[PDB]
PDB file of C-alpha atoms and ligand atoms in Angstrom:
ATOM      1  CA  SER A   1       0.053   0.267   0.302  1.00  0.00           C
ATOM      2  CA  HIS A   2       1.838   3.520   1.083  1.00  0.00           C
ATOM      3  CA  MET A   3      -0.946   5.843  -0.595  1.00  0.00           C
ATOM      4  CA  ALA A   4       2.031   8.333  -2.222  1.00  0.00           C
ATOM      5  CA  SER A   5       2.711   6.143  -4.348  1.00  0.00           C
ATOM      6  CA  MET A   6      -0.088   3.795  -5.320  1.00  0.00           C
ATOM      7  CA  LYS A   7      -0.752   3.467  -9.447  1.00  0.00           C
ATOM      8  CA  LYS A   8      -3.717   4.118 -11.262  1.00  0.00           C
ATOM      9  CA  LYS A   9      -4.214   1.972 -14.302  1.00  0.00           C
ATOM     10  CA  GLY A  10      -4.248   3.599 -18.034  1.00  0.00           C
ATOM     11  CA  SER A  11      -6.652   3.892 -20.393  1.00  0.00           C
ATOM     12  CA  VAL A  12      -7.820   1.066 -22.769  1.00  0.00           C
ATOM     13  CA  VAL A  13      -6.312   2.746 -25.616  1.00  0.00           C
ATOM     14  CA  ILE A  14      -7.417   2.236 -30.066  1.00  0.00           C
ATOM     15  CA  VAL A  15      -4.526   1.254 -31.643  1.00  0.00           C
ATOM     16  CA  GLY A  16      -6.815   0.395 -35.116  1.00  0.00           C
ATOM     17  CA  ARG A  17      -9.602  -0.767 -36.573  1.00  0.00           C
ATOM     18  CA  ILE A  18     -10.460  -3.978 -39.273  1.00  0.00           C
ATOM     19  CA  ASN A  19     -11.358  -1.775 -41.803  1.00  0.00           C
ATOM     20  CA  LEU A  20     -14.967  -3.626 -43.292  1.00  0.00           C
ATOM     21  CA  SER A  21     -15.890  -0.121 -45.422  1.00  0.00           C
ATOM     22  CA  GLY A  22     -14.572  -1.724 -48.929  1.00  0.00           C
ATOM     23  CA  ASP A  23     -14.926  -5.054 -50.491  1.00  0.00           C
ATOM     24  CA  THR A  24     -11.554  -5.953 -48.934  1.00  0.00           C
ATOM     25  CA  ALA A  25     -11.821  -6.581 -45.241  1.00  0.00           C
ATOM     26  CA  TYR A  26      -8.286  -5.957 -43.807  1.00  0.00           C
ATOM     27  CA  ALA A  27      -6.556  -5.002 -40.216  1.00  0.00           C
ATOM     28  CA  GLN A  28      -4.656  -1.682 -40.229  1.00  0.00           C
ATOM     29  CA  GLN A  29      -2.633   0.206 -37.185  1.00  0.00           C
ATOM     30  CA  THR A  30      -3.413   3.614 -35.903  1.00  0.00           C
ATOM     31  CA  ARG A  31      -0.822   4.125 -33.513  1.00  0.00           C
ATOM     32  CA  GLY A  32       2.480   2.315 -32.598  1.00  0.00           C
ATOM     33  CA  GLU A  33       3.400   0.607 -28.850  1.00  0.00           C
ATOM     34  CA  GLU A  34       4.820   3.332 -27.617  1.00  0.00           C
ATOM     35  CA  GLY A  35       2.534   6.374 -28.187  1.00  0.00           C
ATOM     36  CA  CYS A  36      -0.545   3.570 -27.153  1.00  0.00           C
ATOM     37  CA  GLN A  37       1.789   3.808 -23.781  1.00  0.00           C
ATOM     38  CA  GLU A  38       1.326   7.165 -23.322  1.00  0.00           C
ATOM     39  CA  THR A  39      -2.212   8.116 -24.434  1.00  0.00           C
ATOM     40  CA  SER A  40      -3.135   5.128 -21.796  1.00  0.00           C
ATOM     41  CA  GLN A  41      -1.788   7.516 -19.173  1.00  0.00           C
ATOM     42  CA  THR A  42      -2.994  10.459 -20.346  1.00  0.00           C
ATOM     43  CA  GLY A  43      -6.016   9.121 -21.459  1.00  0.00           C
ATOM     44  CA  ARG A  44      -6.104  12.264 -23.702  1.00  0.00           C
ATOM     45  CA  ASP A  45      -6.239  10.546 -27.577  1.00  0.00           C
ATOM     46  CA  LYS A  46      -6.570  12.863 -30.388  1.00  0.00           C
ATOM     47  CA  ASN A  47      -6.114  10.910 -33.038  1.00  0.00           C
ATOM     48  CA  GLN A  48      -9.373  10.558 -35.971  1.00  0.00           C
ATOM     49  CA  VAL A  49     -12.086   7.545 -35.419  1.00  0.00           C
ATOM     50  CA  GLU A  50     -13.370   5.460 -38.041  1.00  0.00           C
ATOM     51  CA  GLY A  51     -15.262   2.814 -38.799  1.00  0.00           C
ATOM     52  CA  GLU A  52     -17.439   0.215 -36.926  1.00  0.00           C
ATOM     53  CA  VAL A  53     -14.973  -1.960 -35.444  1.00  0.00           C
ATOM     54  CA  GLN A  54     -11.354  -0.791 -33.202  1.00  0.00           C
ATOM     55  CA  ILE A  55      -8.077  -2.786 -31.874  1.00  0.00           C
ATOM     56  CA  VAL A  56      -7.921  -2.036 -28.957  1.00  0.00           C
ATOM     57  CA  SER A  57      -5.335  -1.753 -26.357  1.00  0.00           C
ATOM     58  CA  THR A  58      -4.451  -2.170 -22.386  1.00  0.00           C
ATOM     59  CA  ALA A  59      -0.557  -2.497 -21.105  1.00  0.00           C
ATOM     60  CA  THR A  60      -1.253  -5.960 -20.843  1.00  0.00           C
ATOM     61  CA  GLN A  61      -3.161  -7.001 -23.272  1.00  0.00           C
ATOM     62  CA  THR A  62      -5.520  -6.200 -27.005  1.00  0.00           C
ATOM     63  CA  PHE A  63      -8.653  -6.983 -27.978  1.00  0.00           C
ATOM     64  CA  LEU A  64     -11.246  -5.466 -29.981  1.00  0.00           C
ATOM     65  CA  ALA A  65     -14.175  -3.402 -29.497  1.00  0.00           C
ATOM     66  CA  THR A  66     -17.280  -2.304 -32.131  1.00  0.00           C
ATOM     67  CA  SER A  67     -19.805   0.368 -32.233  1.00  0.00           C
ATOM     68  CA  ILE A  68     -24.173  -0.584 -31.935  1.00  0.00           C
ATOM     69  CA  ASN A  69     -26.301   1.909 -31.349  1.00  0.00           C
ATOM     70  CA  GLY A  70     -23.704   4.877 -30.970  1.00  0.00           C
ATOM     71  CA  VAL A  71     -21.725   2.853 -27.895  1.00  0.00           C
ATOM     72  CA  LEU A  72     -18.766   1.313 -27.961  1.00  0.00           C
ATOM     73  CA  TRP A  73     -19.054  -2.349 -26.625  1.00  0.00           C
ATOM     74  CA  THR A  74     -16.140  -4.771 -25.442  1.00  0.00           C
ATOM     75  CA  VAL A  75     -15.491  -7.344 -23.052  1.00  0.00           C
ATOM     76  CA  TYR A  76     -15.101  -7.004 -19.582  1.00  0.00           C
ATOM     77  CA  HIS A  77     -11.630  -9.556 -19.723  1.00  0.00           C
ATOM     78  CA  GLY A  78     -10.070  -7.104 -21.364  1.00  0.00           C
ATOM     79  CA  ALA A  79     -11.297  -3.882 -20.475  1.00  0.00           C
ATOM     80  CA  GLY A  80     -11.879  -4.047 -16.977  1.00  0.00           C
ATOM     81  CA  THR A  81     -13.852  -1.018 -15.664  1.00  0.00           C
ATOM     82  CA  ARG A  82     -10.423   1.191 -17.231  1.00  0.00           C
ATOM     83  CA  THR A  83     -11.396   4.773 -18.901  1.00  0.00           C
ATOM     84  CA  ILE A  84     -11.342   4.494 -22.080  1.00  0.00           C
ATOM     85  CA  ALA A  85      -9.057   7.670 -24.495  1.00  0.00           C
ATOM     86  CA  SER A  86     -10.764  10.094 -25.807  1.00  0.00           C
ATOM     87  CA  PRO A  87      -9.449  13.814 -27.657  1.00  0.00           C
ATOM     88  CA  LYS A  88     -11.075  15.149 -24.341  1.00  0.00           C
ATOM     89  CA  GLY A  89      -9.259  12.810 -21.928  1.00  0.00           C
ATOM     90  CA  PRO A  90     -10.567   9.432 -19.867  1.00  0.00           C
ATOM     91  CA  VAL A  91     -13.905   8.521 -21.345  1.00  0.00           C
ATOM     92  CA  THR A  92     -15.768   7.058 -17.924  1.00  0.00           C
ATOM     93  CA  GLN A  93     -17.256   3.359 -19.244  1.00  0.00           C
ATOM     94  CA  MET A  94     -21.431   4.029 -19.578  1.00  0.00           C
ATOM     95  CA  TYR A  95     -22.290   0.906 -19.472  1.00  0.00           C
ATOM     96  CA  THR A  96     -20.519  -2.591 -16.670  1.00  0.00           C
ATOM     97  CA  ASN A  97     -21.332  -5.564 -16.942  1.00  0.00           C
ATOM     98  CA  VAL A  98     -19.435  -8.048 -15.559  1.00  0.00           C
ATOM     99  CA  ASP A  99     -22.428 -11.289 -15.260  1.00  0.00           C
ATOM    100  CA  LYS A 100     -22.638 -10.485 -19.243  1.00  0.00           C
ATOM    101  CA  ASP A 101     -18.900 -10.361 -19.834  1.00  0.00           C
ATOM    102  CA  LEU A 102     -19.760  -6.297 -21.458  1.00  0.00           C
ATOM    103  CA  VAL A 103     -18.944  -3.190 -20.895  1.00  0.00           C
ATOM    104  CA  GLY A 104     -19.307   0.145 -22.919  1.00  0.00           C
ATOM    105  CA  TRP A 105     -18.612   3.503 -23.528  1.00  0.00           C
ATOM    106  CA  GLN A 106     -19.673   5.984 -25.690  1.00  0.00           C
ATOM    107  CA  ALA A 107     -18.798   6.072 -29.520  1.00  0.00           C
ATOM    108  CA  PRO A 108     -16.087   8.103 -30.407  1.00  0.00           C
ATOM    109  CA  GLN A 109     -16.741  11.088 -32.879  1.00  0.00           C
ATOM    110  CA  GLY A 110     -15.482   9.654 -36.070  1.00  0.00           C
ATOM    111  CA  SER A 111     -17.284   5.963 -35.599  1.00  0.00           C
ATOM    112  CA  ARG A 112     -20.274   4.453 -37.159  1.00  0.00           C
ATOM    113  CA  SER A 113     -22.278   2.184 -35.542  1.00  0.00           C
ATOM    114  CA  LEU A 114     -24.103  -1.221 -37.068  1.00  0.00           C
ATOM    115  CA  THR A 115     -27.693  -1.480 -36.548  1.00  0.00           C
ATOM    116  CA  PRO A 116     -28.444  -4.409 -34.321  1.00  0.00           C
ATOM    117  CA  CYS A 117     -29.990  -6.952 -36.352  1.00  0.00           C
ATOM    118  CA  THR A 118     -34.271  -7.629 -36.458  1.00  0.00           C
ATOM    119  CA  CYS A 119     -33.672 -11.446 -39.529  1.00  0.00           C
ATOM    120  CA  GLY A 120     -33.940 -13.559 -36.758  1.00  0.00           C
ATOM    121  CA  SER A 121     -31.605 -15.090 -39.107  1.00  0.00           C
ATOM    122  CA  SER A 122     -28.972 -18.196 -38.138  1.00  0.00           C
ATOM    123  CA  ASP A 123     -26.007 -17.628 -41.108  1.00  0.00           C
ATOM    124  CA  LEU A 124     -23.008 -15.746 -39.400  1.00  0.00           C
ATOM    125  CA  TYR A 125     -19.612 -13.898 -39.954  1.00  0.00           C
ATOM    126  CA  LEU A 126     -16.740 -13.388 -37.459  1.00  0.00           C
ATOM    127  CA  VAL A 127     -14.700 -10.562 -37.438  1.00  0.00           C
ATOM    128  CA  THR A 128     -10.757 -11.557 -35.636  1.00  0.00           C
ATOM    129  CA  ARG A 129      -8.237  -8.652 -34.652  1.00  0.00           C
ATOM    130  CA  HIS A 130      -6.206 -10.244 -38.141  1.00  0.00           C
ATOM    131  CA  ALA A 131      -9.664  -8.778 -40.156  1.00  0.00           C
ATOM    132  CA  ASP A 132     -10.671 -12.286 -40.782  1.00  0.00           C
ATOM    133  CA  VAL A 133     -14.342 -12.991 -41.442  1.00  0.00           C
ATOM    134  CA  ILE A 134     -15.305 -16.501 -40.297  1.00  0.00           C
ATOM    135  CA  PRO A 135     -18.423 -17.867 -41.076  1.00  0.00           C
ATOM    136  CA  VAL A 136     -21.009 -19.221 -38.203  1.00  0.00           C
ATOM    137  CA  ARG A 137     -23.503 -21.824 -38.106  1.00  0.00           C
ATOM    138  CA  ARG A 138     -25.936 -19.674 -34.826  1.00  0.00           C
ATOM    139  CA  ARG A 139     -26.633 -23.096 -32.407  1.00  0.00           C
ATOM    140  CA  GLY A 140     -28.498 -21.192 -29.492  1.00  0.00           C
ATOM    141  CA  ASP A 141     -28.992 -17.325 -28.159  1.00  0.00           C
ATOM    142  CA  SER A 142     -25.068 -17.073 -27.516  1.00  0.00           C
ATOM    143  CA  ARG A 143     -23.442 -19.827 -28.623  1.00  0.00           C
ATOM    144  CA  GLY A 144     -22.514 -20.744 -32.650  1.00  0.00           C
ATOM    145  CA  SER A 145     -19.901 -22.897 -34.157  1.00  0.00           C
ATOM    146  CA  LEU A 146     -17.422 -22.774 -37.052  1.00  0.00           C
ATOM    147  CA  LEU A 147     -17.897 -24.284 -40.508  1.00  0.00           C
ATOM    148  CA  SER A 148     -14.424 -24.881 -40.670  1.00  0.00           C
ATOM    149  CA  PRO A 149     -12.068 -25.550 -36.779  1.00  0.00           C
ATOM    150  CA  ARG A 150      -9.033 -23.027 -36.007  1.00  0.00           C
ATOM    151  CA  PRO A 151      -6.588 -23.450 -32.581  1.00  0.00           C
ATOM    152  CA  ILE A 152      -7.421 -20.889 -30.987  1.00  0.00           C
ATOM    153  CA  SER A 153      -4.037 -19.083 -31.144  1.00  0.00           C
ATOM    154  CA  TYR A 154      -6.293 -17.940 -34.330  1.00  0.00           C
ATOM    155  CA  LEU A 155      -9.046 -16.225 -32.554  1.00  0.00           C
ATOM    156  CA  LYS A 156      -6.818 -14.733 -29.176  1.00  0.00           C
ATOM    157  CA  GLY A 157      -6.774 -11.620 -28.488  1.00  0.00           C
ATOM    158  CA  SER A 158     -10.827 -10.775 -30.504  1.00  0.00           C
ATOM    159  CA  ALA A 159     -13.253 -11.062 -28.140  1.00  0.00           C
ATOM    160  CA  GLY A 160     -15.379  -7.750 -27.978  1.00  0.00           C
ATOM    161  CA  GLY A 161     -15.471  -8.171 -31.772  1.00  0.00           C
ATOM    162  CA  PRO A 162     -18.557  -8.389 -33.690  1.00  0.00           C
ATOM    163  CA  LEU A 163     -20.880 -11.352 -35.013  1.00  0.00           C
ATOM    164  CA  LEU A 164     -22.708 -10.247 -38.613  1.00  0.00           C
ATOM    165  CA  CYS A 165     -25.433 -11.914 -40.287  1.00  0.00           C
ATOM    166  CA  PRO A 166     -25.549 -11.615 -44.368  1.00  0.00           C
ATOM    167  CA  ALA A 167     -26.939  -8.127 -44.707  1.00  0.00           C
ATOM    168  CA  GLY A 168     -24.437  -6.661 -42.186  1.00  0.00           C
ATOM    169  CA  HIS A 169     -26.307  -6.099 -38.686  1.00  0.00           C
ATOM    170  CA  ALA A 170     -24.473  -6.841 -35.369  1.00  0.00           C
ATOM    171  CA  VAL A 171     -26.220 -10.341 -34.215  1.00  0.00           C
ATOM    172  CA  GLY A 172     -23.685 -10.440 -31.335  1.00  0.00           C
ATOM    173  CA  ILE A 173     -19.846  -9.025 -29.775  1.00  0.00           C
ATOM    174  CA  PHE A 174     -17.726 -12.528 -29.269  1.00  0.00           C
ATOM    175  CA  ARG A 175     -16.992 -13.003 -25.894  1.00  0.00           C
ATOM    176  CA  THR A 176     -15.183 -16.936 -25.541  1.00  0.00           C
ATOM    177  CA  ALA A 177     -14.037 -19.939 -27.742  1.00  0.00           C
ATOM    178  CA  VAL A 178     -15.140 -22.983 -27.309  1.00  0.00           C
ATOM    179  CA  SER A 179     -12.335 -25.738 -27.337  1.00  0.00           C
ATOM    180  CA  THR A 180     -10.864 -29.243 -26.454  1.00  0.00           C
ATOM    181  CA  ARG A 181      -7.266 -29.642 -26.820  1.00  0.00           C
ATOM    182  CA  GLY A 182      -6.198 -26.285 -28.580  1.00  0.00           C
ATOM    183  CA  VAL A 183      -8.888 -26.705 -31.120  1.00  0.00           C
ATOM    184  CA  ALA A 184     -11.961 -24.323 -31.005  1.00  0.00           C
ATOM    185  CA  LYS A 185     -15.092 -25.349 -32.935  1.00  0.00           C
ATOM    186  CA  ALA A 186     -17.682 -22.488 -31.107  1.00  0.00           C
ATOM    187  CA  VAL A 187     -17.335 -19.989 -29.799  1.00  0.00           C
ATOM    188  CA  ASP A 188     -19.601 -18.323 -27.786  1.00  0.00           C
ATOM    189  CA  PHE A 189     -20.892 -14.706 -27.732  1.00  0.00           C
ATOM    190  CA  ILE A 190     -23.195 -10.996 -25.744  1.00  0.00           C
ATOM    191  CA  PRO A 191     -25.776 -11.575 -28.310  1.00  0.00           C
ATOM    192  CA  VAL A 192     -27.273  -7.610 -29.310  1.00  0.00           C
ATOM    193  CA  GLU A 193     -31.251  -8.260 -27.827  1.00  0.00           C
ATOM    194  CA  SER A 194     -29.005  -8.439 -24.395  1.00  0.00           C
ATOM    195  CA  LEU A 195     -27.083  -5.075 -25.642  1.00  0.00           C
ATOM    196  CA  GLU A 196     -30.428  -3.366 -26.603  1.00  0.00           C
ATOM    197  CA  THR A 197     -31.582  -4.691 -23.268  1.00  0.00           C
ATOM    198  CA  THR A 198     -27.945  -3.157 -21.385  1.00  0.00           C
ATOM    199  CA  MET A 199     -29.503  -0.494 -23.241  1.00  0.00           C
ATOM    200  CA  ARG A 200     -32.489   0.135 -21.405  1.00  0.00           C
ATOM    201  CA  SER A 201     -30.918  -0.463 -18.358  1.00  0.00           C
TER     202      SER A 201
HETATM  203  C1  SUE B 301      -8.864 -17.330 -28.124  1.00  0.00           C
HETATM  204  C2  SUE B 301     -10.213 -15.970 -28.606  1.00  0.00           C
HETATM  205  C3  SUE B 301     -10.937 -15.837 -26.727  1.00  0.00           C
HETATM  206  C4  SUE B 301     -12.207 -14.944 -26.812  1.00  0.00           C
HETATM  207  C5  SUE B 301     -11.694 -14.850 -25.631  1.00  0.00           C
HETATM  208  N1  SUE B 301     -12.150 -14.963 -24.468  1.00  0.00           N
HETATM  209  C6  SUE B 301     -11.543 -15.649 -23.615  1.00  0.00           C
HETATM  210  O1  SUE B 301     -10.182 -15.701 -23.585  1.00  0.00           O
HETATM  211  C7  SUE B 301     -12.363 -15.772 -22.214  1.00  0.00           C
HETATM  212  C8  SUE B 301     -11.578 -15.168 -20.933  1.00  0.00           C
HETATM  213  C9  SUE B 301     -12.556 -15.987 -19.643  1.00  0.00           C
HETATM  214  C10 SUE B 301     -12.235 -17.115 -20.569  1.00  0.00           C
HETATM  215  N2  SUE B 301     -11.611 -17.436 -22.521  1.00  0.00           N
HETATM  216  C11 SUE B 301     -11.493 -18.836 -23.337  1.00  0.00           C
HETATM  217  O2  SUE B 301     -12.048 -18.069 -24.109  1.00  0.00           O
HETATM  218  C12 SUE B 301     -11.339 -19.641 -22.216  1.00  0.00           C
HETATM  219  C13 SUE B 301      -9.922 -20.345 -22.955  1.00  0.00           C
HETATM  220  C14 SUE B 301      -9.393 -21.143 -22.642  1.00  0.00           C
HETATM  221  C15 SUE B 301      -8.440 -18.953 -22.765  1.00  0.00           C
HETATM  222  C16 SUE B 301      -9.716 -19.918 -24.502  1.00  0.00           C
HETATM  223  N3  SUE B 301     -12.000 -20.597 -23.199  1.00  0.00           N
HETATM  224  C17 SUE B 301     -13.196 -20.943 -22.272  1.00  0.00           C
HETATM  225  O3  SUE B 301     -13.380 -20.322 -20.821  1.00  0.00           O
HETATM  226  O4  SUE B 301     -14.397 -21.427 -22.508  1.00  0.00           O
HETATM  227  C18 SUE B 301     -15.678 -22.004 -21.588  1.00  0.00           C
HETATM  228  C19 SUE B 301     -16.868 -21.912 -21.985  1.00  0.00           C
HETATM  229  C20 SUE B 301     -16.919 -20.892 -21.651  1.00  0.00           C
HETATM  230  C21 SUE B 301     -17.572 -20.420 -19.930  1.00  0.00           C
HETATM  231  C22 SUE B 301     -16.765 -19.507 -19.575  1.00  0.00           C
HETATM  232  C23 SUE B 301     -16.888 -18.645 -20.278  1.00  0.00           C
HETATM  233  C24 SUE B 301     -16.469 -17.202 -18.848  1.00  0.00           C
HETATM  234  C25 SUE B 301     -15.912 -16.382 -19.641  1.00  0.00           C
HETATM  235  C26 SUE B 301     -15.476 -15.449 -19.395  1.00  0.00           C
HETATM  236  N4  SUE B 301     -16.014 -14.211 -18.440  1.00  0.00           N
HETATM  237  C27 SUE B 301     -15.235 -12.855 -17.649  1.00  0.00           C
HETATM  238  C28 SUE B 301     -16.443 -12.607 -16.859  1.00  0.00           C
HETATM  239  C29 SUE B 301     -15.853 -11.756 -15.516  1.00  0.00           C
HETATM  240  C30 SUE B 301     -14.660 -12.145 -15.897  1.00  0.00           C
HETATM  241  O5  SUE B 301     -13.601 -10.546 -15.373  1.00  0.00           O
HETATM  242  C31 SUE B 301     -12.781 -10.464 -15.684  1.00  0.00           C
HETATM  243  C32 SUE B 301     -13.399 -12.271 -16.666  1.00  0.00           C
HETATM  244  C33 SUE B 301     -13.875 -13.156 -17.526  1.00  0.00           C
HETATM  245  N5  SUE B 301     -13.406 -13.923 -18.063  1.00  0.00           N
HETATM  246  C34 SUE B 301     -14.058 -14.952 -18.830  1.00  0.00           C
HETATM  247  O6  SUE B 301     -13.655 -16.412 -20.010  1.00  0.00           O
HETATM  248  C35 SUE B 301     -10.367 -13.267 -26.546  1.00  0.00           C
HETATM  249  O7  SUE B 301      -9.901 -13.084 -27.401  1.00  0.00           O
HETATM  250  N6  SUE B 301      -9.343 -13.014 -25.632  1.00  0.00           N
HETATM  251  S1  SUE B 301      -8.337 -12.001 -25.183  1.00  0.00           S
HETATM  252  O8  SUE B 301      -9.448 -11.102 -25.865  1.00  0.00           O
HETATM  253  O9  SUE B 301      -7.269 -12.731 -25.704  1.00  0.00           O
HETATM  254  C36 SUE B 301      -8.107 -10.633 -23.485  1.00  0.00           C
HETATM  255  C37 SUE B 301      -8.226  -9.467 -24.232  1.00  0.00           C
HETATM  256  C38 SUE B 301      -9.286  -9.678 -23.164  1.00  0.00           C
HETATM  257 ZN1   ZN B 302     -29.703  -8.830 -39.658  1.00  0.00          ZN
END
């Protein structure tokens, strides 16, 4: 302890994006490691934000955050209770729910939001932090199966990323991979209706 020397955790910092605006998905880095560490400390990020899916970092982890209905959502297991860096300084979470593994901040100016799905469709697509678009069959409210299994390395750092309907509506937020002996066959996600409930409380 000793209060005079106690440290503060830094802000979550946007360090890039998954670009989905064209015919090709690809990852873009907007901030390297030294700038990220500085921005984490001040909570002041003057970078212009664009797009729906951000790549975010703390001091110890890198993962995704997805804008839906003007809220930038990610996983509690990545972000904890942290603020996010913004042009005006650190921004406090608007939503925090450890039970859902969910947090949200006001979507950054410049971001674009995905629309919540209304199709009731079960043919889905998971966007990874490396900008891979993996097909996923919905198997329950919060479960989908990967049409082609991958090692868990392949999904590491994609928590907070979106599951999309063929149209491109947001169906959910990737939470955790279900694996056996290191191979991911299934995914757990936070369905968008759970977000929408949270957005009414
Ligand atoms: C491989 C990619 C994968 C998506 C990733 N998710 C995880 O690694 C989660 C985090 C943690 C364990 N995870 C797992 O995926 C494990 C693992 C063996 C690692 C594959 N699998 C697993 O549990 O399967 C069991 C069926 C589910 C039942 C148990 C699910 C419990 C979910 C969960 N809830 C809470 C609530 C509150 C918390 O407070 C701190 C913490 C939590 N942590 C949790 O799970 C990811 O990319 N992360 S990340 O981006 O690298 C990182 C920066 C954030
Ligand atoms: Zn839809």
